[PDB]
Coordinates of C-alpha atoms and ligand atoms in Angstrom, one line a residue:
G1 CA 85.6 145.9 172.2
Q2 CA 86.1 149.5 171.1
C3 CA 85.0 150.9 167.7
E4 CA 84.8 154.6 166.8
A5 CA 81.9 156.2 165.0
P6 CA 80.8 155.8 162.2
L7 CA 82.0 152.2 162.9
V8 CA 80.4 149.9 165.5
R9 CA 81.6 146.7 167.2
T10 CA 80.3 143.3 166.1
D11 CA 81.3 139.7 166.4
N12 CA 80.4 139.0 162.7
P13 CA 83.5 138.1 160.6
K14 CA 81.6 139.1 157.5
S15 CA 80.7 142.6 158.7
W16 CA 84.3 143.9 159.4
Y17 CA 85.8 146.7 157.4
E18 CA 88.9 146.2 155.3
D19 CA 91.4 145.5 158.1
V20 CA 89.6 146.9 161.2
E21 CA 88.9 143.6 163.0
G22 CA 85.8 143.7 165.1
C23 CA 84.5 147.0 163.6
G24 CA 82.0 147.3 160.8
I25 CA 80.2 150.3 159.2
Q26 CA 77.1 151.5 161.0
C27 CA 73.7 151.2 159.2
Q28 CA 73.6 155.0 158.4
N29 CA 75.1 156.6 155.3
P30 CA 77.9 158.7 156.9
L31 CA 78.0 161.1 154.0
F32 CA 74.6 162.6 154.8
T33 CA 73.0 164.2 157.8
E34 CA 69.7 163.5 159.5
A35 CA 67.9 166.5 158.1
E36 CA 68.4 165.6 154.5
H37 CA 67.6 161.9 155.3
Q38 CA 64.2 163.1 156.5
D39 CA 63.8 165.3 153.4
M40 CA 64.5 162.4 151.0
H41 CA 62.2 160.1 152.9
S42 CA 59.4 162.7 152.9
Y43 CA 60.1 163.2 149.2
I44 CA 59.7 159.5 148.4
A45 CA 56.5 159.3 150.5
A46 CA 54.8 162.0 148.5
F47 CA 55.4 160.4 145.0
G48 CA 54.9 156.9 146.2
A49 CA 51.5 157.6 147.7
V50 CA 50.3 159.5 144.6
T51 CA 51.5 156.8 142.2
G52 CA 50.0 154.0 144.2
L53 CA 46.6 155.6 144.5
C54 CA 46.2 156.9 140.9
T55 CA 47.7 153.7 139.3
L56 CA 45.3 151.5 141.3
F57 CA 42.3 153.5 140.2
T58 CA 43.2 152.9 136.5
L59 CA 43.6 149.2 137.2
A60 CA 40.2 149.2 138.9
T61 CA 38.7 150.8 135.8
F62 CA 39.9 148.0 133.5
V63 CA 38.6 145.2 135.6
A64 CA 35.3 147.0 136.2
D65 CA 34.3 145.9 132.7
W66 CA 36.9 143.3 131.9
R67 CA 34.6 141.5 129.4
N68 CA 34.5 144.6 127.2
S69 CA 37.8 146.3 128.1
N70 CA 40.0 143.2 127.6
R71 CA 41.1 144.0 124.1
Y72 CA 44.8 143.4 123.4
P73 CA 45.9 146.6 121.7
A74 CA 44.1 148.8 124.4
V75 CA 45.3 146.8 127.4
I76 CA 49.1 147.0 127.0
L77 CA 49.0 150.0 129.3
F78 CA 47.0 148.0 131.9
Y79 CA 50.0 145.8 132.5
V80 CA 52.2 148.8 132.5
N81 CA 50.1 150.3 135.3
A82 CA 50.2 146.9 137.0
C83 CA 54.0 146.8 136.9
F84 CA 54.3 150.3 138.3
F85 CA 51.7 149.7 141.1
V86 CA 53.8 146.8 142.4
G87 CA 57.0 148.9 142.3
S88 CA 55.3 151.7 144.2
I89 CA 54.2 149.2 147.0
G90 CA 57.8 148.0 147.1
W91 CA 59.1 151.5 147.7
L92 CA 56.4 152.3 150.3
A93 CA 57.2 149.3 152.4
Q94 CA 60.0 151.3 154.2
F95 CA 57.4 153.6 155.9
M96 CA 56.0 150.8 158.1
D97 CA 57.1 151.0 161.8
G98 CA 60.7 149.7 162.0
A99 CA 60.8 148.7 158.3
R100 CA 63.9 150.7 157.5
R101 CA 66.0 148.9 160.1
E102 CA 64.6 145.5 159.2
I103 CA 65.2 146.2 155.5
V104 CA 68.5 148.1 155.3
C105 CA 70.3 147.1 158.5
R106 CA 71.8 143.8 159.7
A107 CA 70.9 142.3 163.0
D108 CA 74.2 143.6 164.4
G109 CA 73.3 147.1 163.3
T110 CA 75.7 147.3 160.3
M111 CA 74.9 148.1 156.7
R112 CA 73.6 145.2 154.6
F113 CA 75.7 144.4 151.6
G114 CA 76.3 141.4 149.3
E115 CA 72.9 139.9 149.8
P116 CA 71.6 137.2 149.7
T117 CA 73.4 135.4 152.5
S118 CA 72.4 132.5 154.7
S119 CA 73.5 134.5 157.9
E120 CA 70.7 137.2 157.4
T121 CA 67.0 137.5 156.8
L122 CA 65.1 137.9 153.5
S123 CA 63.7 141.4 154.0
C124 CA 66.4 143.1 151.8
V125 CA 66.0 140.6 149.0
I126 CA 62.2 140.7 149.0
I127 CA 62.1 144.5 148.6
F128 CA 64.8 144.3 145.9
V129 CA 63.1 141.8 143.7
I130 CA 59.8 143.5 144.0
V131 CA 61.1 146.9 142.9
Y132 CA 63.7 145.7 140.4
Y133 CA 61.3 143.3 138.7
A134 CA 58.6 145.9 138.6
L135 CA 61.0 148.4 137.0
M136 CA 62.3 146.0 134.3
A137 CA 58.8 144.5 133.7
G138 CA 57.4 147.9 133.0
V139 CA 60.0 149.1 130.5
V140 CA 59.7 145.8 128.6
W141 CA 56.0 146.5 128.2
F142 CA 57.0 150.0 127.0
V143 CA 58.8 148.6 123.9
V144 CA 55.7 146.4 123.3
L145 CA 53.5 149.6 123.5
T146 CA 55.5 151.3 120.8
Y147 CA 55.6 148.2 118.6
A148 CA 51.8 147.9 118.9
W149 CA 51.5 151.5 117.9
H150 CA 53.8 150.9 115.0
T151 CA 51.8 148.0 113.7
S152 CA 48.4 149.5 114.6
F153 CA 48.4 151.4 111.3
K154 CA 47.8 148.0 109.5
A155 CA 44.2 148.1 110.9
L156 CA 42.9 150.0 107.9
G157 CA 41.0 148.6 104.9
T158 CA 40.9 145.1 106.4
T159 CA 39.3 143.0 109.1
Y160 CA 42.5 141.3 110.2
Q161 CA 43.6 142.2 113.7
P162 CA 47.4 142.6 113.8
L163 CA 49.2 140.6 116.6
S164 CA 46.0 138.8 117.4
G165 CA 47.9 135.5 117.3
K166 CA 50.9 136.9 119.2
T167 CA 49.3 137.8 122.5
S168 CA 50.8 135.0 124.5
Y169 CA 54.1 135.4 122.6
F170 CA 54.6 138.8 124.0
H171 CA 53.6 137.8 127.5
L172 CA 56.2 135.0 127.7
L173 CA 59.0 137.2 126.5
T174 CA 57.7 140.2 128.6
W175 CA 57.7 138.4 131.9
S176 CA 60.7 136.0 131.3
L177 CA 63.3 138.6 130.6
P178 CA 63.1 140.6 133.9
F179 CA 63.0 137.3 135.8
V180 CA 66.2 136.1 134.2
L181 CA 68.0 139.4 135.1
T182 CA 66.7 139.2 138.7
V183 CA 68.1 135.7 139.1
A184 CA 71.4 136.8 137.5
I185 CA 71.8 139.5 140.2
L186 CA 71.0 137.1 143.0
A187 CA 73.5 134.6 141.6
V188 CA 76.4 137.1 142.1
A189 CA 75.1 138.5 145.5
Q190 CA 75.3 142.2 144.6
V191 CA 72.1 143.4 146.4
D192 CA 73.0 146.2 148.7
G193 CA 71.1 148.4 151.1
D194 CA 71.1 152.2 151.3
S195 CA 69.4 154.3 154.0
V196 CA 69.1 157.3 151.7
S197 CA 66.7 155.6 149.3
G198 CA 65.3 153.2 152.0
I199 CA 65.4 150.1 149.8
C200 CA 67.9 147.5 148.7
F201 CA 69.2 147.8 145.1
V202 CA 72.0 146.8 142.8
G203 CA 75.6 147.8 143.0
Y204 CA 75.9 150.4 145.7
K205 CA 79.2 148.7 146.7
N206 CA 80.4 148.3 143.1
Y207 CA 79.3 150.7 140.3
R208 CA 80.0 148.1 137.6
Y209 CA 77.1 145.9 138.6
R210 CA 74.7 148.9 138.7
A211 CA 75.8 149.9 135.2
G212 CA 75.5 146.4 133.9
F213 CA 72.1 145.4 135.3
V214 CA 70.2 148.8 135.4
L215 CA 71.8 151.3 133.0
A216 CA 72.5 148.9 130.2
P217 CA 69.0 147.2 129.9
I218 CA 67.3 150.6 130.2
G219 CA 69.4 151.9 127.3
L220 CA 68.4 149.0 125.1
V221 CA 64.7 149.5 125.5
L222 CA 65.1 153.2 124.7
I223 CA 66.8 152.2 121.4
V224 CA 64.1 149.7 120.5
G225 CA 61.3 152.0 121.7
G226 CA 62.7 154.9 119.7
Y227 CA 63.1 152.8 116.6
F228 CA 59.4 151.8 116.5
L229 CA 58.3 155.3 117.5
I230 CA 60.3 156.9 114.7
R231 CA 58.7 154.5 112.1
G232 CA 55.3 155.3 113.5
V233 CA 55.9 159.0 113.0
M234 CA 56.9 158.5 109.4
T235 CA 53.7 156.5 108.8
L236 CA 51.5 159.1 110.5
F237 CA 53.2 162.1 108.9
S238 CA 53.1 160.4 105.5
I239 CA 49.3 159.8 105.9
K240 CA 48.5 163.5 106.8
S241 CA 50.6 164.8 104.0
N242 CA 49.1 162.6 101.3
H243 CA 45.8 161.2 102.6
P244 CA 44.8 163.3 105.6
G245 CA 41.3 162.6 107.0
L246 CA 41.6 158.9 106.4
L247 CA 39.4 158.8 109.5
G248 CA 35.9 158.4 110.8
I249 CA 33.7 159.7 107.9
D250 CA 35.7 161.0 104.8
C251 CA 37.4 164.3 104.4
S252 CA 40.6 164.7 102.3
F253 CA 42.0 166.0 99.0
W254 CA 39.4 163.5 97.8
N255 CA 35.8 164.2 98.3
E256 CA 32.6 163.1 96.5
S257 CA 31.8 166.7 95.6
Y258 CA 35.2 167.4 94.0
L259 CA 34.5 165.4 90.8
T260 CA 31.6 166.0 88.5
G261 CA 29.7 164.0 85.9
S262 CA 29.3 160.3 85.4
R263 CA 32.1 157.6 85.2
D264 CA 31.8 157.3 81.5
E265 CA 31.7 161.1 80.9
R266 CA 34.9 161.6 82.7
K267 CA 36.5 158.6 80.9
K268 CA 35.5 160.0 77.5
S269 CA 37.0 163.4 78.4
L270 CA 40.3 161.9 79.6
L271 CA 40.5 159.6 76.6
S272 CA 39.9 162.5 74.3
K273 CA 42.8 164.4 75.9
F274 CA 45.0 161.4 75.3
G275 CA 43.8 160.8 71.8
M276 CA 42.2 157.5 72.7
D277 CA 38.8 156.0 72.0
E278 CA 36.4 154.4 74.4
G279 CA 37.5 151.2 76.1
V280 CA 38.2 149.4 79.3
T281 CA 40.9 151.5 81.1
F282 CA 43.7 150.0 83.2
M283 CA 45.9 152.5 85.0
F284 CA 49.3 152.2 86.8
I285 CA 51.2 154.9 88.6
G286 CA 54.5 154.4 90.4
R287 CA 58.2 154.7 90.3
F288 CA 60.1 152.9 87.5
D289 CA 62.1 150.8 89.9
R290 CA 63.3 147.1 89.8
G291 CA 62.6 144.7 92.6
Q292 CA 60.1 147.0 94.4
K293 CA 57.5 147.8 91.8
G294 CA 56.8 145.4 88.9
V295 CA 57.0 147.9 86.1
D296 CA 59.0 145.3 84.1
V297 CA 56.4 142.7 85.0
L298 CA 53.6 145.1 83.9
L299 CA 55.4 146.0 80.6
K300 CA 56.1 142.3 79.9
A301 CA 52.5 141.5 80.5
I302 CA 51.4 143.9 77.9
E303 CA 53.7 142.2 75.4
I304 CA 52.1 138.9 76.2
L305 CA 48.7 140.5 76.2
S306 CA 49.3 142.0 72.8
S307 CA 48.7 138.6 71.2
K308 CA 45.1 138.4 72.3
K309 CA 42.1 139.6 70.2
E310 CA 40.7 141.3 73.2
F311 CA 43.8 143.6 73.3
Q312 CA 42.1 146.2 71.1
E313 CA 39.1 146.4 73.5
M314 CA 41.3 147.7 76.4
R315 CA 43.0 151.1 77.1
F316 CA 46.1 151.5 79.2
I317 CA 47.9 154.4 80.9
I318 CA 51.3 154.3 82.7
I319 CA 52.6 157.2 84.9
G320 CA 56.0 157.5 86.4
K321 CA 59.7 158.0 85.9
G322 CA 62.9 156.4 87.0
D323 CA 65.3 153.9 85.3
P324 CA 65.8 155.2 81.7
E325 CA 65.6 151.7 80.2
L326 CA 62.1 151.2 81.6
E327 CA 61.2 154.7 80.2
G328 CA 62.6 153.7 76.8
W329 CA 60.8 150.4 76.9
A330 CA 57.5 152.1 77.8
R331 CA 57.8 154.7 75.0
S332 CA 58.7 152.0 72.5
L333 CA 55.5 150.1 73.3
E334 CA 53.6 153.4 73.1
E335 CA 54.5 153.8 69.4
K336 CA 54.3 150.1 68.6
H337 CA 50.8 149.8 70.2
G338 CA 48.8 153.0 69.9
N339 CA 46.3 152.2 72.6
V340 CA 48.5 153.2 75.7
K341 CA 49.5 156.5 77.1
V342 CA 52.9 157.1 78.7
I343 CA 53.5 160.0 81.1
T344 CA 56.9 160.6 82.6
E345 CA 56.5 164.2 84.0
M346 CA 55.4 165.4 87.4
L347 CA 51.6 165.0 87.5
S348 CA 49.5 167.3 89.7
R349 CA 47.4 165.9 92.6
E350 CA 44.3 167.4 91.0
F351 CA 44.8 165.4 87.8
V352 CA 45.4 162.2 89.8
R353 CA 42.2 162.6 91.8
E354 CA 40.1 162.9 88.7
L355 CA 42.0 160.0 87.0
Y356 CA 41.5 157.7 90.0
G357 CA 37.8 158.4 90.0
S358 CA 37.3 157.7 86.3
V359 CA 39.5 154.6 85.5
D360 CA 37.9 151.2 85.7
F361 CA 40.9 149.3 87.2
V362 CA 44.2 150.2 88.9
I363 CA 47.2 147.9 88.7
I364 CA 49.6 147.5 91.7
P365 CA 52.3 145.0 90.5
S366 CA 54.5 145.5 93.6
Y367 CA 57.2 143.1 94.8
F368 CA 56.9 144.4 98.4
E369 CA 54.2 146.6 100.1
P370 CA 54.4 147.6 103.8
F371 CA 50.7 147.4 104.6
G372 CA 49.0 148.9 101.5
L373 CA 48.0 152.5 102.3
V374 CA 48.7 153.4 98.7
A375 CA 45.9 151.1 97.5
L376 CA 43.3 152.8 99.7
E377 CA 43.1 156.0 97.8
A378 CA 42.1 154.2 94.6
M379 CA 39.5 152.2 96.5
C380 CA 38.2 155.4 98.0
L381 CA 37.6 156.7 94.5
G382 CA 35.8 153.6 93.3
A383 CA 38.6 151.9 91.4
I384 CA 38.8 148.1 91.4
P385 CA 42.4 147.1 92.2
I386 CA 44.5 144.3 90.8
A387 CA 47.6 143.8 92.9
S388 CA 50.4 141.4 93.7
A389 CA 49.7 139.1 96.7
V390 CA 52.7 140.5 98.7
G391 CA 53.2 142.2 102.0
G392 CA 50.2 143.3 104.0
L393 CA 48.2 144.2 100.9
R394 CA 46.7 140.7 100.9
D395 CA 44.7 141.6 104.0
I396 CA 42.9 144.5 102.2
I397 CA 41.9 142.9 98.8
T398 CA 39.4 140.1 98.9
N399 CA 37.5 138.1 96.3
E400 CA 34.5 140.5 96.5
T401 CA 36.8 143.6 96.2
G402 CA 39.5 142.8 93.6
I403 CA 42.0 140.3 92.1
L404 CA 45.2 139.1 93.7
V405 CA 48.1 137.6 91.6
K406 CA 51.4 136.0 92.3
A407 CA 54.3 138.5 92.1
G408 CA 56.7 138.2 89.2
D409 CA 54.3 136.3 86.9
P410 CA 53.5 138.5 83.9
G411 CA 51.5 135.6 82.4
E412 CA 49.2 135.4 85.5
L413 CA 48.9 139.1 85.5
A414 CA 47.7 139.0 81.9
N415 CA 45.2 136.3 82.9
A416 CA 43.9 138.6 85.6
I417 CA 43.4 141.4 83.0
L418 CA 41.4 138.9 81.0
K419 CA 39.4 138.1 84.1
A420 CA 38.8 141.9 84.5
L421 CA 37.3 141.9 81.0
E422 CA 34.8 139.2 82.1
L423 CA 33.8 141.4 85.1
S424 CA 33.7 144.6 83.0
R425 CA 31.1 143.1 80.6
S426 CA 28.8 142.9 83.7
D427 CA 27.7 145.3 86.3
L428 CA 30.7 146.4 88.4
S429 CA 28.6 148.6 90.8
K430 CA 28.9 146.1 93.7
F431 CA 32.7 146.0 93.4
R432 CA 33.0 149.8 93.5
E433 CA 30.6 150.0 96.5
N434 CA 32.6 147.3 98.3
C435 CA 35.9 149.2 97.6
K436 CA 34.7 152.4 99.2
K437 CA 33.1 150.7 102.2
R438 CA 36.0 148.5 103.0
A439 CA 38.7 151.1 102.6
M440 CA 37.1 153.5 105.2
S441 CA 36.3 150.7 107.8
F442 CA 37.8 148.2 110.1
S443 CA 36.3 145.2 112.0
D444 CA 36.6 146.6 115.5
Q445 CA 33.0 147.7 115.6
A446 CA 32.6 147.4 119.3
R447 CA 31.4 151.0 119.2
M448 CA 31.1 152.0 115.5
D449 CA 34.8 152.3 114.3
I450 CA 34.4 156.1 113.8
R451 CA 36.6 159.1 114.7
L452 CA 35.5 158.7 118.3
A453 CA 36.4 154.9 118.3
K454 CA 39.4 154.1 116.2
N455 CA 41.5 157.1 116.9
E456 CA 42.3 155.5 120.3
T457 CA 44.7 153.0 118.7
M458 CA 46.2 155.5 116.1
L459 CA 46.5 158.9 117.9
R460 CA 45.9 158.5 121.6
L461 CA 48.2 155.4 121.8
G462 CA 50.8 157.5 120.0
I463 CA 50.8 160.2 122.6
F464 CA 51.4 157.8 125.5
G465 CA 54.1 156.1 123.5
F466 CA 56.2 159.3 123.4
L467 CA 55.1 160.3 126.9
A468 CA 56.4 157.2 128.4
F469 CA 59.6 157.5 126.3
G470 CA 60.4 160.9 127.8
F471 CA 60.4 159.8 131.4
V472 CA 62.4 156.7 130.7
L473 CA 65.0 158.8 128.9
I474 CA 65.3 161.0 132.0
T475 CA 65.7 157.9 134.2
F476 CA 68.5 156.7 131.8
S477 CA 70.3 160.1 132.2
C478 CA 70.3 160.0 136.0
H479 CA 71.8 156.5 136.1
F480 CA 74.2 157.5 133.4
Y481 CA 75.4 160.6 135.3
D482 CA 75.9 158.6 138.5
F483 CA 77.8 155.8 136.7
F484 CA 80.3 158.4 135.3
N485 CA 80.9 159.9 138.8
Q486 CA 80.4 156.8 141.0
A487 CA 84.0 155.8 140.8
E488 CA 85.3 159.0 142.4
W489 CA 82.6 158.9 145.1
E490 CA 83.7 155.4 146.0
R491 CA 87.3 156.7 146.5
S492 CA 86.0 159.7 148.5
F493 CA 83.9 157.4 150.7
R494 CA 86.9 155.2 151.5
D495 CA 89.1 158.1 152.4
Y496 CA 86.5 159.8 154.5
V497 CA 85.6 156.8 156.7
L498 CA 89.3 155.9 157.6
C499 CA 90.0 159.3 159.2
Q500 CA 86.9 159.3 161.4
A501 CA 88.3 157.1 164.3
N502 CA 90.8 159.9 165.5
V503 CA 93.0 157.5 167.4
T504 CA 95.5 160.1 168.5
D505 CA 89.8 167.3 160.7
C506 CA 88.0 165.1 158.2
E507 CA 86.6 166.5 155.0
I508 CA 84.4 165.1 152.2
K509 CA 85.9 165.5 148.8
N510 CA 82.6 164.9 147.1
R511 CA 79.4 162.7 147.4
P512 CA 76.4 161.6 145.3
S513 CA 74.1 164.5 144.5
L514 CA 70.7 164.3 146.2
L515 CA 69.2 166.4 143.4
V516 CA 70.0 163.6 140.9
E517 CA 68.3 161.1 143.2
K518 CA 65.1 163.2 143.3
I519 CA 64.9 163.6 139.6
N520 CA 65.5 159.9 139.1
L521 CA 62.6 159.1 141.5
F522 CA 60.5 161.7 139.7
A523 CA 60.9 160.1 136.3
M524 CA 60.3 156.6 137.7
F525 CA 57.2 157.6 139.6
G526 CA 56.3 160.0 136.8
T527 CA 56.0 157.2 134.3
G528 CA 53.5 155.3 136.5
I529 CA 51.5 158.5 137.1
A530 CA 51.7 159.6 133.4
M531 CA 50.3 156.2 132.2
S532 CA 47.5 156.4 134.7
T533 CA 45.6 159.0 132.6
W534 CA 44.7 156.5 129.9
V535 CA 41.2 156.1 131.4
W536 CA 40.7 159.9 132.0
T537 CA 37.8 160.2 129.5
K538 CA 34.0 160.8 129.7
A539 CA 33.1 157.2 128.8
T540 CA 34.9 155.8 131.9
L541 CA 33.1 158.2 134.1
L542 CA 29.8 156.8 132.8
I543 CA 30.9 153.3 133.5
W544 CA 31.9 154.3 137.1
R545 CA 28.6 156.2 137.4
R546 CA 26.6 153.0 136.5
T547 CA 29.1 150.8 138.5
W548 CA 28.2 152.8 141.6
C549 CA 24.5 152.1 140.8
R550 CA 25.1 148.5 141.9
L551 CA 23.9 149.3 145.4
Ligands
CLR1 C1 61.4 161.3 118.6 C2 60.0 160.7 118.6 C3 60.1 159.2 119.0 C4 59.2 161.4 119.7 C5 57.7 160.9 119.6 C6 57.1 161.2 118.3 C7 56.2 162.4 118.2 C8 57.0 163.5 117.5 C9 54.9 162.1 117.6 C10 54.3 160.8 118.2 C11 52.8 161.1 118.5 C12 52.5 162.2 117.6 C13 51.2 163.0 117.9 C14 50.1 162.0 118.0 C15 48.9 162.9 118.3 C16 48.6 163.8 117.4 C17 47.1 164.1 117.1 C18 46.9 164.3 115.6 O1 45.5 164.7 115.4 C19 47.8 165.4 115.2 C20 49.3 164.9 115.3 C21 49.7 164.6 116.7 C22 49.7 165.9 117.5 C23 51.0 163.9 116.7 C24 52.2 164.8 116.5 C25 53.6 164.1 116.6 C26 53.7 163.1 117.7 C27 53.8 163.8 119.1

């Protein structure tokens, strides 16, 4: 009945150490002393309390006005805060009286490992699933947050709400995936306790399961989250370089005051410069590519259009360079039909701005268009677009704004040009007015989609996307570091424990670093705290101020 510390005597055949019959390992990490146990427990308490309180307040803010705040692209972070709140409560459970022994220790006083098991209680499993599910549920929402930001740039020039029909689709995948992982861990009975952290978690006894079920899934969400974030940056940077100020009023390289004179006066000036007489002007600018922009379609349409008697009533201009055969084809038509201008050089932005604001119609014969930002500048300048019904550009152009055609059909395109002539013989003022109003608006007029309203889902969302990414990257690094060195610490732990009995000095080769543990906790709690600032604005204070006035 004798066992030497750190081992204790028990009658459980499942608690005995490798060959030491009757003796198992006490429920106290032998590689750390009491003083640093109290330090770590105090450290956890501070972050847990702060995360719980601040996260709960944000959740209270959303439900205070759920009828108006329940808007899909702006409530992704609400579920993120919900996930982290549950995780925080899971961590804080250990600070109830006697909780650590009931959670970490077996009834015989030995360390819990290999849970679940029918011979012990459910306290270790309950804490494990709460914390682990909360962790994985949160980071799965994070990749949804970045994806929403990536697609939120489609909410310009249209009324269509992206992902409006996919809200339940995300939810089912978001909650199902962490549930599957949780069940997989329980199926292999790898839930182990640790007095240092104060909770049960994966793979303390075997590093391989901790790498598989924690490190690996966290790595994948970082890859996906980074991918969408990178594309979002390219979109946002591309906007500011080319069309900055595509925002609440209008202020860019375009402005109403930059161009002078009437529409006809500028048209006559440009046509004089090109040696052309008055007519209905159709303009296209773009790269002379194949399969991406229909330059071949546009050029072929002119050949078909050349047979009509109305051909002499219209004026054309093509700007761009690229494949030399398209360039030769365009120049040949220029000489064959002396009513079209061909430009292959680099054209200044100043010239383009005046050209866009003078030409009657702009042609966009694309084969693919991401979401149609290139068509918005022409609409801002009063041009009436004719475009292929491809990509996300179909959501911008409507019957009262322009003409859509099937891609690849030069005959249909020519018919659309003939339709443009029918409109051009009448008053086009309504079409130009609709083009400007639509391009600088969206249908989310809950509070006047202006710079104080729509920047929420373009700029503010972007900040939190990268902010969450940073903390999750730190968490990945901590687990990555431990995984590299866990194998040696296991060997050290084995060697250290054996010499303790002294059955006639022991030394610790190495151990897990408490500093890495603190940083990992900081990043985990930091994400919950960081995402709790979404509602830190003046408007929410007013809501709370009036909410308190229910009294
Ligand atoms: C490597 C990537 C994923 C990191 C995250 C992307 C970073 C670089 C992006 C995402 C969000 C972006 C910011 C979003 C907010 C604004 C406000 C805007 O008025 C000016 C640009 C500015 C300041 C952006 C600068 C670049 C930014 C911080």
